[PDB]
Amino acid sequence: DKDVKYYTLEEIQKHKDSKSTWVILHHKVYDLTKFLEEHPGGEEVLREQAGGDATENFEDVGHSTDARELSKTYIIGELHPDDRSKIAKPSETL
Numbered sequence: 001d002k003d004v005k006y007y008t009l010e011e012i013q014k015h016k017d018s019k020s021t022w023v024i025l026h027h028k029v030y031d032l033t034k035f036l037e038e039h040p041g042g043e044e045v046l047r048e049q050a051g052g053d054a055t056e057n058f059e060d061v062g063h064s065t066d067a068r069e070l071s072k073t074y075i076i077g078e079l080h081p082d083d084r085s086k087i088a089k090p091s092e093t094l
């Protein structure tokens with residue numbers, strides 16, 4: 001623990017508390033808690049999904065490369081290797 005910051009999908013799916021909004025863009029866990037307002041776009045767009053693959057939205061817009069490398073500066077952790085190494089098809093319902 002407290003090294004690489006490896007978090008599992010379901011674990012990250014429990015990071016949407018009050019003032020704890022995480023997002024796993026691509027295969028990297030970014031903490032945007034202190035970026036909700038700072039984000040030149042807003043908080044709600046950040047707090048829309050949270051704790052999950054927000055790449056869908058992120059890429060829906062694409063973002064500039066400036067923001068891409070910025071993600072790295074906001075990298076807190078990464079998707080658990082057990083999962084990432086063998087991308088398992090996530091469950092869903094509706």
Ligand code: HEM
Nearest residue numbers: 030040041045046048054057058061063064066067070071
């Ligand atoms: C790594 C995390 C993120 C960073 C560092 C980031 C950074 C930025 C930056 C710098 C811009 C300004 C435009 C540009 O220069 O490209 C921007 C705009 C924007 N971002 Fe993000 N962003 C992040 C995640 C997200 C996510 C996941 C969403 C959606 C769920 C989002 C939605 C938007 C929208 C909508 C705008 C433009 C506002 C508008 O025209 O409505 N961003 N972002």
